[PDB]
Design a protein around this ligand. Structure first.
Ligand SMILES: CC[C@@H]1C[C@@]2(C)C=C(C)[C@@H](C)C[C@]23NC(=O)C(=C3O)C(=O)[C@@]2(C)[C@@H]3CCC[C@H](O)[C@H]3C=C[C@H]2C[C@H]1O
Ligand SMILES: CC[C@@H]1C[C@@]2(C)C=C(C)[C@@H](C)C[C@]23NC(=O)C(=C3O)C(=O)[C@@]2(C)[C@@H]3CCC[C@H](O)[C@H]3C=C[C@H]2C[C@H]1O
Lengths: 142, 145
């Protein structure tokens, strides 16, 4: 029963933010629709030694669930240097913002294929609007 | 051996129950102190039938409306299927919202049962909105690996 367990990953996250809002022209303007704030992000993954273990790409949008709690929905994947890809996606409470956040993950290729689990992220520093610093962990089981 | 295994479910009749929220400006709490917008979202729970009429599973997920840099209105979905044979398939991704009647497709991953280790595409096409709470959808799931 194999367990992949990447801990204390250092994630440089390059963030392209759009606040969205009420659509003002196009097909969306004629509909009861609001454009959520979104972030397109492009990450580099490093182990403790400072070696690049992979990359990441995904997108996250803000919304609120049935009770009014502010949430975010993410869809993303990691391409790791040794071969495989791991997808991760789900919703998580937005606040507090320095809290560790987790969503289910699924290994799809390489040595991760057929394994599922959880990808975790936690904001450490936000030097500027285009860069976020995160410590991550990945736990996969099968 | 070096043999590809595939799953191909076509012409699924998917009855989808939608709980829709408008979104907009957050007017209370920590979120109201920031220039963020809550997207219009839908939380759905589906029943899946094959063409013969026998149920083959359920689905549950969330989708939120946003836009990309050029202003193309998009949705991002995160869902999973649970099938009657026991296995589980997650699917998630972004897709252009318009036209709303064209088939939309996002990546899918089999995670358990006969689907484990296979990845591909989950496709959904809206056929009717018989009431504000119900979608009738034609869907398909393709996985290989
Ligand atoms: C809820 C945790 C989140 C941290 C994390 C680390 C959590 C994730 C799951 C990863 C995808 C990476 C993320 N990194 C991020 O920069 C990020 C993230 O989604 C964001 O959304 C930011 C930039 C928003 C963009 C939308 C508009 C806001 O002005 C902005 C206000 C702070 C953060 C939110 C931050 O508090
Ligand atoms: C992209 C088109 C979409 C087709 C599909 C079939 C595509 C999907 C990937 C599935 C999740 C199933 C969905 N079915 C759905 O009812 C659904 C879906 O996202 C929706 O978003 C609805 C309810 C929105 C809710 C958010 C606010 C909008 O005012 C509303 C206006 C009609 C539909 C849009 C529908 O036309």
């Amino acid at each position: 029963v194999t367990t992949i367990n990447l801990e204390d990953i250092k994630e440089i996250c390059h963030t392209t933010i759009r606040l969205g809002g009420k659509p003002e022209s196009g097909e969306a303007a004629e509909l009861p629709i609001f454009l959520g704030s979104s972030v397109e992000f492009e990450d580099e993954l490093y182990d403790a030694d400072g070696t690049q273990i992979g990359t990441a790409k995904g997108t996250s949008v803000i919304f609120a669930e049935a009770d009014g709690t502010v949430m975010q929905i993410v869809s993303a994947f990691d391409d790791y240097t040794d071969g495989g890809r791991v997808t991760w996606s789900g919703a998580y409470t937005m606040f507090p913002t320095d809290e560790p956040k987790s969503v289910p993950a699924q290994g799809v290729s390489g040595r991760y294929r057929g394994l599922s689990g959880t990808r975790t992220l936690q904001l450490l520093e936000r030097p500027d609007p285009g860069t976020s610093l995160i410590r991550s962990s990945l736990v996969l089981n099968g």
